[PDB]
Design a protein around this ligand. Structure first.
Ligand SMILES: NC(=O)N[C@@H](CC(=O)O)C(=O)O
Ligand SMILES: NC(=O)N[C@@H](CC(=O)O)C(=O)O
Ligand SMILES: [Zn+2]
Ligand SMILES: [Zn+2]
Ligand SMILES: [Zn+2]
Ligand SMILES: [Zn+2]
Ligand SMILES: [Zn+2]
Ligand SMILES: [Zn+2]
Lengths: 363, 363
């Protein structure tokens, strides 16, 4: 007996096109998404060229329209030069991405004043998300308050961060957050097995206490999102390993395992991979779209999943229970038992749908 | 013709006793203060042992009472273990010091949650000051708002920081700040002359643009304070140079030079070295206390000033106009033209004066 789920949404993926297509491209990354029960993705802007201006966004839109197999929205990225220049294209993006710490990214800002400038100039009704670790979470929350708007915190990974956000929510501040599966299912205990190259990720893997704190504070977590960050094994194992884990194909099975163990409910999962992503980012429904999962199937994660060009996974050897059997996207069978059945280009930019524009007051 | 000033107050000095007395002690540091026209100092807690508990404070109080030549108050320092334990001695201190970044200091905290705990437990009516650079200023401002109280930011050094504080004040937030003379009178341009060891200080010396921004935003600066941070020349020039500059003997002459050039007024100076320190820290008046300065005397800063045991200065070679001629402290001549005339032990703990307790609602 299969369980029918709505089309799940991952608001944080790196699909590497343009410019890093040996790591992943729209076609392979969205195949990975479908195999993971995800029918809509929001792609980050730290590509080459990075998506920090209108011409780069135009290019990325066309590449995505030609290559994506599931539906998508594309983030714009904040830079040290583009505040006040994105107004005409802002509404066509998933939101604005701020990179506020060192990581795989034309996009660290030099000064909190540049963060302020972005918060002041980006349209007030559109989403802003931030890579903001440790004290940076408090700092960007301060900027959001000074500019009297909301902010969404990407991949919360630490007890420190989730408790800060918890305190902010208790004060009624407009902040939401997401957590990635590696920060729920891996910790320092796994670094011996992974090694120092494979183990590189930002935010870094946390202690057992960090992991336990995220679970204990599940009520504070608005979304799950993979931070799918594919790099090849050669890159991960080489002399300057880039941070990041692939995760689209493993996220839902890991979380289904947790549901089966009573660690969270099916509803808790659906709030975090469907309803809250929709409402935070004003993402439209997908008609005739659903995912069928088998909650009984026990399997062990192999050394690589079938679709991501990363061709490795940090979850190798973990025992999971739950698998994606079928995905239907807008009335077409998109995935069945290991086979993707929609071609590159089937996917659409949801921000171009009438129902996918973010509502705003007449300007 | 001399000008009579009130007794000036430096709310940020490191006097190194206990435990670093080759660098400075209460007797030498307060001689330096008097020679710089300063009659009251607030001493930081990063000594050895650090002033992070009641027994250490008791020791420091006695050492200061026996050695100080001018009046003083002693800060307590926040640690990872003492939140919620300082209530009985809190009112006897200048305030609570938080070290939130890497610098010469049992006292970096590991987590913003520890900052929160201090803001929640330290009595709400008593001062909190923070070493908080760049984004850390925004982060600690966020903690202050979450806990609905004020904060004072130490040694603001950057355009980024002063503009953030300016924006916070425009939103009516209870934040004050101080600036040290080296961030007004030295910059990157001086690093060649100083060299990499002598030039080490935290916050680091800023660009010309940082310096210009602090001057342009003088209205945002509540206090001047030296961050007198003496280390010996051997230490500054050695293989692991500690950050910090001595500054008590040079601060007032540098600022008087600026007054003479019309860069700020005598009133602007007195707000920042007398009236605002008094009101932010609830420091009492000193009866029969004044400083006489000669605004006409031109001189060049030598390779070391007479009193600080640091026996070096980063301001060597700068031409100044203005000198301290006489200091009277509580009816006794304390300093005349290079001679200190009050003994170690003349100085008193102002928090023990009836008028020096911080007022509070009956608890
Ligand atoms: N998480 C990572 O370690 N790397 C991400 C960047 C990011 O999400 O910060 C990537 O794009 O590779
Ligand atoms: N400013 C410095 O460079 N060092 C100070 C510490 C401090 O004020 O942060 C010191 O105590 O030496
Ligand atoms: Zn990130
Ligand atoms: Zn994110
Ligand atoms: Zn990312
Ligand atoms: Zn400091
Ligand atoms: Zn200070
Ligand atoms: Zn200091």
């Amino acid at each position: 007996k299969l369980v029918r789920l709505p089309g799940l949404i991952d608001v944080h993926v790196h699909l590497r096109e343009p410019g890093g297509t040996h790591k992943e491209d729209f076609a392979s990354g969205t195949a990975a998404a479908l195999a993971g029960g995800i029918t809509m993705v929001c792609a980050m802007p730290n590509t080459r060229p990075p998506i920090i201006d209108a011409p780069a966004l135009a290019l990325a839109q066309k590449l995505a329209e030609a290559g994506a197999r599931c539906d998508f929205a594309l983030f714009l990225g904040a830079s040290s030069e583009n505040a006040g220049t994105l107004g005409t294209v802002a509404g066509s993006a998933a939101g604005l991405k701020l990179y506020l710490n060192e990581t795989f990214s034309e996009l660290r800002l030099d000064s909190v004043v540049q963060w302020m400038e972005h918060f002041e100039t980006w349209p007030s009704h559109l989403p802003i998300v931030a890579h903001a670790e440790q004290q940076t979470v408090a700092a960007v929350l301060m900027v959001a308050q000074l500019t009297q708007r909301s902010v969404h915190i990407c991949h919360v990974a630490r007890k420190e961060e989730i408790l800060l956000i918890k305190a902010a929510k208790a004060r009624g501040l407009p902040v939401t957050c997401e957590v990635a599966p590696h920060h729920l299912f891996l910790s320092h205990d796994d670094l011996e097995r992974l090694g120092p190259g494979k183990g590189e990720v930002r935010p870094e893997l946390g202690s057992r206490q960090d992991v336990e704190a995220l679970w204990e504070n599940m009520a504070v977590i608005d979304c799950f999102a993979s931070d799918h960050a594919p790099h090849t094994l050669e890159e991960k194992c080489g002399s300057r390993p880039p941070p990041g884990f692939p995760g689209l194909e493993t996220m839902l099975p890991l979380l289904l395992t947790a549901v089966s163990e009573g660690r969270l409910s099916l509803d808790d999962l659906l709030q975090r991979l469907h309803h809250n992503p929709r409402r935070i980012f004003h993402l439209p429904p997908q008609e005739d779209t659903y995912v069928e999962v088998d909650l009984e199937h026990e399997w062990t994660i192999p050394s690589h999943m079938p679709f991501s060009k990363a061709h490795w996974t940090p979850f190798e050897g973990q025992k999971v229970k739950g698998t994606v059997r079928r995905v239907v996207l807008r009335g077409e069978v998109a995935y069945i038992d290991g086979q993707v059945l929609v071609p590159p280009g089937y996917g659409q930019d949801v921000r171009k749908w009438p129902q996918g524009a973010v509502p705003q007051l007449p300007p």
